Amino acid sequence: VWKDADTTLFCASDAKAHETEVHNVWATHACVPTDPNPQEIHLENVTENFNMWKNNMVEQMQEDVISLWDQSLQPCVKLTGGSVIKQACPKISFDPIPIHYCTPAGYVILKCNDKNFNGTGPCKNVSSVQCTHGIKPVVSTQLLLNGSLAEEEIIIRSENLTNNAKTIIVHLNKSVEINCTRPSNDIRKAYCEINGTKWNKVLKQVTEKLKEHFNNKTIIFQPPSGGDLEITMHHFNCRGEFFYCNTTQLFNNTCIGKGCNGTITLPCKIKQIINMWQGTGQAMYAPPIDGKINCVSNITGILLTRDGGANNTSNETFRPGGGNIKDNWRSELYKYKVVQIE
Amino acid sequence: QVRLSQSGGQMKKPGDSMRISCRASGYEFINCPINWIRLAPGKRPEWMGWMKPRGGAVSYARQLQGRVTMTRDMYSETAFLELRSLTSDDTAVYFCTRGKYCTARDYYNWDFEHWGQGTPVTVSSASTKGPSVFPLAPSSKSTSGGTAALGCLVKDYFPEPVTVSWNSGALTSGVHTFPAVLQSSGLYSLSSVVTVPSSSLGTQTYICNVNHKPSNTKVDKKVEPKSC
Amino acid sequence: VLTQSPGTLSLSPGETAIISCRTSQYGSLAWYQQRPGQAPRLVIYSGSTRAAGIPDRFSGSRWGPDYTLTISNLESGDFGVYYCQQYEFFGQGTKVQVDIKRTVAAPSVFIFPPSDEQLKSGTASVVCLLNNFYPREAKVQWKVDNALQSGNSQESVTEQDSKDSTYSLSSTLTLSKADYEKHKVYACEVTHQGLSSPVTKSFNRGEC
Numbered sequence: 001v002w003k004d005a006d007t008t009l010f011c012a013s014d015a016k017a018h019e020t021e022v023h024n025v026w027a028t029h030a031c032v033p034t035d036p037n038p039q040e041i042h043l044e045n046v047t048e049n050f051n052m053w054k055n056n057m058v059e060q061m062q063e064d065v066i067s068l069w070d071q072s073l074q075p076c077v078k079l080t081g082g083s084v085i086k087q088a089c090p091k092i093s094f095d096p097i098p099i100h101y102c103t104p105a106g107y108v109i110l111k112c113n114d115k116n117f118n119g120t121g122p123c124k125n126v127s128s129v130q131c132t133h134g135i136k137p138v139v140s141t142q143l144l145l146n147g148s149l150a151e152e153e154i155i156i157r158s159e160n161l162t163n164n165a166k167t168i169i170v171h172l173n174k175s176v177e178i179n180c181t182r183p184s185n186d187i188r189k190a191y192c193e194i195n196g197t198k199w200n201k202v203l204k205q206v207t208e209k210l211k212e213h214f215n216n217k218t219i220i221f222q223p224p225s226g227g228d229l230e231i232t233m234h235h236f237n238c239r240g241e242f243f244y245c246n247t248t249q250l251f252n253n254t255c256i257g258k259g260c261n262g263t264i265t266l267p268c269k270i271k272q273i274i275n276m277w278q279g280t281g282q283a284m285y286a287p288p289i290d291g292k293i294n295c296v297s298n299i300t301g302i303l304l305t306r307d308g309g310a311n312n313t314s315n316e317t318f319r320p321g322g323g324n325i326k327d328n329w330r331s332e333l334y335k336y337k338v339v340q341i342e
Numbered sequence: 343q344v345r346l347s348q349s350g351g352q353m354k355k356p357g358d359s360m361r362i363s364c365r366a367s368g369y370e371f372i373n374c375p376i377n378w379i380r381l382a383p384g385k386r387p388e389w390m391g392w393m394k395p396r397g398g399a400v401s402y403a404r405q406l407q408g409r410v411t412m413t414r415d416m417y418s419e420t421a422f423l424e425l426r427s428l429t430s431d432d433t434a435v436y437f438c439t440r441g442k443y444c445t446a447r448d449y450y451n452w453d454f455e456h457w458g459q460g461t462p463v464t465v466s467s468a469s470t471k472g473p474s475v476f477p478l479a480p481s482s483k484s485t486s487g488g489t490a491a492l493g494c495l496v497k498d499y500f501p502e503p504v505t506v507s508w509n510s511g512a513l514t515s516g517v518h519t520f521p522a523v524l525q526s527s528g529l530y531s532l533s534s535v536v537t538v539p540s541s542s543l544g545t546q547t548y549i550c551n552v553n554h555k556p557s558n559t560k561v562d563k564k565v566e567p568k569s570c
Numbered sequence: 571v572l573t574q575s576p577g578t579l580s581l582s583p584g585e586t587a588i589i590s591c592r593t594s595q596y597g598s599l600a601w602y603q604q605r606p607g608q609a610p611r612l613v614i615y616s617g618s619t620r621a622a623g624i625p626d627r628f629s630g631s632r633w634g635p636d637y638t639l640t641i642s643n644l645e646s647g648d649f650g651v652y653y654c655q656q657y658e659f660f661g662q663g664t665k666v667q668v669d670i671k672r673t674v675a676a677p678s679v680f681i682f683p684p685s686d687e688q689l690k691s692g693t694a695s696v697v698c699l700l701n702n703f704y705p706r707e708a709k710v711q712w713k714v715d716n717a718l719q720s721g722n723s724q725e726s727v728t729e730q731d732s733k734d735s736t737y738s739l740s741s742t743l744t745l746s747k748a749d750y751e752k753h754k755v756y757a758c759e760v761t762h763q764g765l766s767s768p769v770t771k772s773f774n775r776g777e778c
């Protein structure tokens with residue numbers, strides 16, 4: 001017999017004490033070695049309720065990632081609170097590693113294994129584990145990179161699709177690579193490449209899944225309505241550099257309605273002056289490193305917001321979302337919940 | 343204590359743009375979304391959109407898509423609303439609002455406990471148009487044992503208001519001047535009536551006096567029984 | 571999606587106001603009050619949960635899709651306009667205004683054909699007057715050659731008279747001069763509590 005509860009989880013990883021890489025260094029001092037032979041116990045005749053939007057595991061992951069970033073990605077100048085802080089800002093090795101979250105004694109993690117689970121409600125096949133799978137703390141907006149894929153069908157996730165203030169997470173069942181590059185020899189200019197054939201076919205599948213949730217209305221995509229660059233563009237960190245990519249071409253309604261078939265190339269720019277995602281102010285970093293900067297990632301999900309208003313048309317509008325990085329963790333922690341044994 | 347202070351009201355012509363501000367205090371500004379709701383008399387309250395201070399994320403109502411813009415200033419904790427291409431339909435009182443439930447971890451946007459004091463915005467043409475005054479004739483036969491109704495119709499004027507007196511204000515008993523209605527043409531119209539003894543229709547003269555200050559118009563109209 | 575009923579509520583202090591809202595989807599429904607010249611105020615949220623400062627005289631209930639706000643023992647600070655809300659959607663509003671009670675008085679109904687002066691302008695306005703009645707509730711229907719009219723009429727009602735506590739209503743039917751000359755019989759039908767049956771005043775175009 002158990003009950004839902006919240007406790008201080010501990011971290012596990014496969015960090016290398018010899019690595020200078022930032023996540024490895026953090027995990028060395030913050031985490032413990034992983035388990036070679038994990039234990040999972042499947043529970044039949046047991047039905048449990050889950051709610052990915054009220055899962056406090058997310059809150060703890062959020063603190064760690066903030067701590068990791070704040071103690072690693074140090075700016076040259078920090079502008080917050082109307083004051084000026086000048087520090088040292090050396091270039092770093094940056095590439096996220098998988099992180100497992102685990103429960104102490106008396107607590108256990110319950111895991112939903114329903115292949116079509118949408119994040120809230122009851123689950124039929126529940127297993128009992130001590131640790132989650134290896135989750136990479138990838139910080140991004142609009143697109144979810146390098147995450148886990150949905151088992152069966154594309155899954156739409158929202159605390160409440162009626163509430164246009166609630167984020168929508170689209171969980172893909174087939175990843176699509178995005179190939180971002182800052183070539184050697186403007187040093188701040190970059191670009192991302194995506195296979196238009198793969199992407200548009202997935203995007204077509206996304207609209208058809210949404211139709212199931214919105215009474216077969218016409219599904220339309222639009223660019224973000226406004227906000228800081230971190231949300232109006234696809235924002236992410238590659239090799240320690242802050243990238244901002246324009247995703248207008250990624251959501252082409254014409255290609256999901258001839259010629260669109262090919263290689264899509266998004267314009268990007270590496271910024272040195274960014275808004276601190278600690279909800280504070282502006283941080284200033286050094287120019288990018290010389291040579292070809294490159295990262296190939298899996299697009300495994302999409303963050304969306306749906307338009308509202310007192311209207312009366314048979315078409316819904318969706319826009320690339322983001323901003324709240326806690327949603328990035330929700331998308332990986334959705335099948336987990338902490339219970340306390342007796 | 344949560345407070346929302348809005349800027350002062352203003353008047354605009356059709357075609358102009360407007361900007362209004364909402365200064366927030368009493369709570370952690372970046373935690374909660376801010377909404378804008380406008381209210382016009384006779385009409386359903388209309389949600390315009392919300393804005394989340396942290397990254398300035400915004401969601402605009404479909405019917406306002408393209409004309410509206412919401413921003414914020416972090417230092418002064420002030421939210422801003424811009425509305426462009428104004429017309430008569432934008433005449434209303436504009437409110438900023440924030441939901442009752444707000445924590446660092448969670449919120450509910452739509453239970454609006456907190457409202458600003460409101461910013462009235464009028465959008466109208468500077469043009470004026472004087473009223474047409476038509477007689478509402480009593481009847482044809484005189485009944486020496488009853489009361490007769492008469493009045494004048496005051497049609498197609500802009501803007502408000504018009505006033506009506508009778509016999510230069512010497513006739514007040516049984517007078518009814520109705521609230522004006524807004525017609526499809528965009529022009530106002532009202533009626534003024536009065537009940538009098540039918541036995542005085544051949545003796546007393548009844549004149550309605552209509553005043554429309556915006557157009558500098560004063561019209562007197564004698565209302566008398568039709569000839570047939 | 572949100573159908574608030576009715577439109578205007580005319581009550582005396584001490585009485586109870588019953589305001590209802592029919593929704594098409596279930597979910598957190600809120601009620602707001604707007605006093606004259608003041609910003610709206612959250613009265614009830616989540617169907618029946620009373621907000622801060624709100625007296626237990628206010629109560630929310632729900633039967634099927636019908637949400638109801640009842641205000642017992644009306645005070646001066648209760649009168650105004652009330653709105654229901656679900657997410658970003660609002661109801662049309664319910665105006666709750668002060669009514670001073672008196673004996674029932676049937677209206678006196680007059681009808682005025684279009685002026686000959688106005689008929690030289692291409693437009694025709696027919697005016698129906700309901701004079702000095704109580705209670706305020708009244709229905710007016712226009713008929714043109716025994717055909718129910720709709721979408722071409724506007725009504726106006728006076729404030730309750732400070733001397734005799736009655737109301738007066740004006741209804742105007744507007745037609746083009748051409749369309750007006752097409753028909754003969756023009757009638758307004760009046761139904762009111764003080765009338766044993768609906769009263770119809772009418773006239774025939776051309777004849778005096």
Ligand SMILES: *[C@@H]1O[C@H](CO)[C@@H](O)[C@H](O)[C@H]1NC(C)=O
Pocket residue numbers: 113114115116117124125
């Ligand atoms: C739960 O297990 C059943 C029985 O083996 C299996 O058929 C099914 O795939 C599981 N449920 C879901 C929703 O996948």
Ligand SMILES: *[C@@H]1O[C@H](CO)[C@@H](O)[C@H](O)[C@H]1NC(C)=O
Pocket residue numbers: 146147175297298
């Ligand atoms: C990217 O996806 C492929 C399959 O789609 C997988 O083999 C690979 O491990 C993924 N890379 C990650 C998760 O970093």
Ligand SMILES: *[C@@H]1O[C@H](CO)[C@@H](O)[C@H](O)[C@H]1NC(C)=O
Pocket residue numbers: 151152153154155173174205209
């Ligand atoms: C992914 O899900 C879609 C339905 O949303 C389905 O059409 C498609 O076949 C799936 N792809 C797989 C299982 O590889």
Ligand SMILES: *[C@@H]1O[C@H](CO)[C@@H](O)[C@H](O)[C@H]1NC(C)=O
Pocket residue numbers: 118119120121122156157158159161
């Ligand atoms: C998820 O499934 C549950 C089943 O109880 C349902 O109530 C909920 O609306 C679903 N959510 C979405 C986003 O489809």
Ligand SMILES: *[C@@H]1O[C@H](CO)[C@@H](O)[C@H](O)[C@H]1NC(C)=O
Pocket residue numbers: 179180181193296
């Ligand atoms: C990524 O794009 C670059 C050119 O920008 C290309 O040379 C490279 O082969 C691509 N990488 C992959 C894995 O496709």
Ligand SMILES: *[C@@H]1O[C@H](CO)[C@@H](O)[C@H](O)[C@H]1NC(C)=O
Pocket residue numbers: 195196197198262263
């Ligand atoms: C895009 O992907 C398809 C497979 O889905 C592949 O056959 C094609 O060569 C790719 N196009 C380019 C330009 O790489």
Ligand SMILES: *[C@@H]1O[C@H](CO)[C@@H](O)[C@H](O)[C@H]1NC(C)=O
Pocket residue numbers: 232233246247248
């Ligand atoms: C994104 O790129 C498109 C390119 O067509 C451009 O129209 C749009 O203004 C850009 N948006 C931002 C926020 O830079």
Ligand SMILES: *[C@@H]1O[C@H](CO)[C@@H](O)[C@H](O)[C@H]1NC(C)=O
Pocket residue numbers: 248249250252253254255258259260
């Ligand atoms: C969308 O796709 C079509 C097809 O290639 C192209 O002609 C058009 O210019 C594209 N527009 C945007 C905004 O991506």
Ligand SMILES: *[C@@H]1O[C@H](CO)[C@@H](O)[C@H](O)[C@H]1NC(C)=O
Pocket residue numbers: 095096138145146236237238239294295296297298
């Ligand atoms: C995703 O993982 C690959 C290696 O699997 C790495 O090269 C890439 O930089 C990662 N992307 C991000 C955005 O961290």
Ligand SMILES: *[C@@H]1O[C@H](CO)[C@@H](O)[C@H](O)[C@H]1NC(C)=O
Pocket residue numbers: 120159160597598
């Ligand atoms: C959706 O929102 C309503 C209130 O609007 C709430 O009562 C309900 O529990 C929510 N549903 C879920 C699955 O969270």
